[PDB]
Design a protein around this ligand. Structure first.
Ligand code: SRM
Ligand code: SF4
Ligand code: FES
Ligand SMILES: [Mg+2]
Lengths: 567, 96
């Protein structure tokens, strides 16, 4: 048995057909095969679910931006495009990319070619392909941060589709000028020393069938868990020498959030420590891992296709041994690492080269209205490059000291506040878009989170919890987990028209996996759960103990009893 | 408008009253009636039923093609009653 998508892939001539013919039909939508194919080119057909008894089709595009880095030229194009062809907003994402919603089919080619021609790409932003590769968003010049970022860029390059359907469709097979890929990447991509490649294929790594499902990699330096490393298919951590010189990488494998309500055979998972490789080996080890998934990940049932399942089934030792056959050597022992710390990168900070950066807090990544206009004026006036963070925030990079005051002023006039002036609950909150354009949403997330945050702060006040205190709150409209709610101290996961499943047990540094606490909590009822939990936390926590640590220490039995006993 | 919705389940006939702005699955569960589901976004066969009399608005759904809807199949998670309606539930296997 093979899923319908495997056949669509098989019969597409490397992602061209019938997308090619559907893109030029008079219909406002495209057919089912083309719907599936266009995801590979970084676009999703959507319909607006706020308008009922009538389908208004539109397309969302999603960029590829390894490390979240966005060149000034690309930022200006995306901003203009959102107003001219979209619905006036840009959406920063939990994988450091932009999404642009609301593009009519007739304008879709115009918009992707514009992106292509302004230093951007949407290739493999969706699809059964490697997704945006995460890295530390802060533009620090510190050696190992720089090295994390370069490594992420090489991995994205290594795993970029090579078939040419992309430029064929969107820029009519034009040559598009880009900076040359490091010889390291080309050489690793081409290596077939260990039977990893299809050397006669237009896709020497992906082959005809690409991967069984999406594949996600994050890269970081020891200690910095802004990337939420444990949720990824591969987590890669730079290991240095005492003098700060990178020597190698620790690798984790087999994380993922996706699950389905009532299908207990689906579940979120933390990535396991796999091993260590010397720095020159990294692209070889990464391919070895991707090829293991390519060759063994289930293609019969898409709910079980992620790499996390093959690792759950096989166990990490059998997984490692299989990967080593393609790497052609053995992993060294995983090297001890320091404790993880979450970093928002928000506020005014130093790059280390004399310039400043500023992290702009953006609720839910939604950039629109005056805030959008003000950010574009700043970014254009100062010719800034920018960086998108995995918490849906934006960093303004490369700022002269003398520009600090004028920028701070302009941002304040637009209501874009410095972290000291934002409720700490907002600073660490995320929600996925959900309704109205997500076809999978069961309830609101982005459009309901901010009244929920205010409700949580009201519970804190009522309990007598200080206003500098906080918990990580993440909300999704369905259990796919796009805002990583299974890592949250307090997750709400849509499970009915106005009800959420509550998850607890995540920690402030995203080092632990939350567990399902209660099902079908109605939106109206959330305080009946929260007030007793936060009363018990305030009354019994140890000094400075986070709500997530407290949760894991006290355990669900006592927590349900406190909640039960309130009602 | 609220309609009589008779559900033919492997266990019995249950009769419920559902508003024309409330998905059949959503109302059923709200009463205490256990029906199958997975995605609850009209994108699969989990909640599949058969319409045996009456009509529904299931235009939010996306899984079934036009032929299958013409044959009276329904995704109950994404279906609004538009009349009194009899539905045989737990028909995913039949489909499928
Ligand atoms: C925009 C974004 C959420 C956000 O607020 O930022 C997002 C939004 C969507 N996600 Fe996601 N996901 C986003 C990161 C995540 C993450 C987080 C991460 O990667 O760290 C996860 C959990 C990690 C994981 O994959 O397990 C995530 C798990 C999914 C899933 C479940 C995947 C699975 O294997 O089970 C789907 C559904 C699917 O692929 O079948 C999904 C699919 C979608 C779709 C495309 C719905 C669809 O399939 O048509 C989303 C569109 C909503 C809209 O209207 O714009 N999205 N998605 C984030 C986009 C990241 C990117 O640029 O690539
Ligand atoms: S978690 Fe579900 S509702 Fe939210 S964007 Fe992802 S697929 Fe849509
Ligand atoms: S539950 Fe997936 S279609 Fe209704
Ligand atoms: Mg944010």
């Amino acid at each position: 048995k093979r899923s319908k998508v495997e056949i669509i892939k098989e019969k597409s001539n490397f992602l061209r057909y019938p997308l090619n013919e559907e893109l030029v039909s008079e219909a406002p939508n495209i057919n089912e095969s083309a719907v599936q194919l266009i995801k590979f080119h970084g676009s999703y057909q959507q319909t607006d679910r706020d308008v009922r008894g009538q389908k208004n089709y539109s397309f969302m595009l999603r960029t590829k931006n390894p490390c979240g880095k966005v060149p000034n030229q690309l930022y200006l194009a995306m901003d203009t495009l959102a107003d001219e062809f979209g619905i006036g907003t840009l959406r920063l994402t939990t994988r450091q990319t932009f999404q642009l919603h609301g593009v009519l089919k007739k304008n879709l080619k115009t918009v992707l070619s514009t992106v292509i021609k302004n230093m951007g790409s949407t290739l493999g932003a969706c699809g059964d392909l490697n997704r945006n590769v995460l890295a530390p968003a802060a533009p620090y010049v510190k050696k190992d941060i720089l090295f994390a970022q370069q490594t992420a860029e090489n991995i994205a390059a290594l795993l970029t589709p090579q078939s040419g359907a992309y430029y064929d469709l969107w820029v009519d097979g034009e040559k598009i000028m880009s900076a040359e890929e490091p010889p390291e990447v080309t050489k690793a991509r081409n290596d077939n020393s260990h039977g990893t490649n299809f050397p006669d294929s237009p896709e020497p790594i992906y082959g005809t069938q690409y991967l069984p499902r999406k594949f996600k990699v994050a890269v970081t330096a020891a200690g910095d868990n802004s990337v939420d490393i444990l949720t990824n298919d591969i987590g890669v951590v730079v290991v240095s020498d005492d003098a700060g010189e990178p020597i190698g990488f620790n690798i984790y494998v087999g994380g993922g959030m996706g699950r389905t309500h009532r299908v207990e055979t689906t579940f979120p998972r933390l990535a396991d420590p796999l091993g260590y490789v010397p720095k020159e080996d990294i692209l070889y080890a990464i391919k070895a891992i991707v090829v293991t998934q390519r060759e063994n990940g289930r293609r019969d049932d898409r709910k079980y296709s992620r790499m996390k399942y093959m690792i759950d089934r096989w166990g990490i030792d059998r997984f490692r041994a299989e990967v080593e056959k393609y790497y052609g050597k053995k992993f060294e022992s995983f090297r001890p690492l320091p404790e993880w710390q979450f970093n928002s990168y928000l506020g005014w900070q130093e790059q280390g080269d004399g310039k400043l950066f500023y992290g702009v807090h953006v609720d839910n990544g939604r950039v629109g209205g005056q805030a959008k206009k003000t950010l574009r004026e700043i970014i254009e006036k100062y010719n800034l490059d920018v960086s998108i963070t995995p918490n849906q925030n934006l960093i303004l990079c490369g700022i002269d000291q003398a520009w600090r005051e004028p920028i701070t002023t302009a941002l304040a006039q637009a209501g874009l506040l410095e972290p000291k002036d934002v409720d700490p609950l907002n600073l660490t909150a995320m929600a996925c878009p959900a309704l109205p354009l997500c076809p999978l949403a069961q309830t609101e997330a982005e459009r309901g989170i901010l009244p929920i945050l205010k409700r949580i702060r009201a519970v804190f006040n009522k309990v007598g919890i200080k206003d500098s205190e906080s918990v990580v709150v993440r909300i999704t409209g369905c259990p796919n987990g796009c805002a990583r709610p299974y890592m949250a101290e307090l997750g709400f996961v849509g499970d009915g028209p106005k009800s959420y499943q509550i998850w607890l047990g995540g920690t402030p540094n995203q080092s632990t996996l939350a567990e399902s606490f209660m099902d079908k909590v109605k939106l109206d009822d959330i305080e009946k759960v929260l007030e007793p939990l936060f009363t018990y936390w305030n009354g019994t926590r140890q000094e400075g103990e986070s709500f997530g640590s407290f949760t894991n220490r006290t355990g669900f039995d006592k927590l349900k009893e406190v909640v039960n006993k309130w009602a | 408008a609220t309609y009589n919705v008779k559900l033919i389940t492997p266990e019995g006939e249950v009769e419920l009253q559902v508003p024309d702005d409330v998905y059949i699955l959503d109302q059923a569960e709200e009463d205490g009636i256990d029906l199958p589901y997975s995605c609850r976004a009209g994108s699969c066969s989990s909640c599949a039923g058969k319409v045996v009399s009456g009509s529904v608005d299931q235009s939010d759904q996306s899984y079934l093609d036009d032929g299958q809807i013409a044959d009276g199949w329904v995704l109950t998670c994404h279906a609004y009653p538009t009349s009194d309606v009899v539905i045989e539930t737990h028909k995913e296997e039949e489909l499928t």
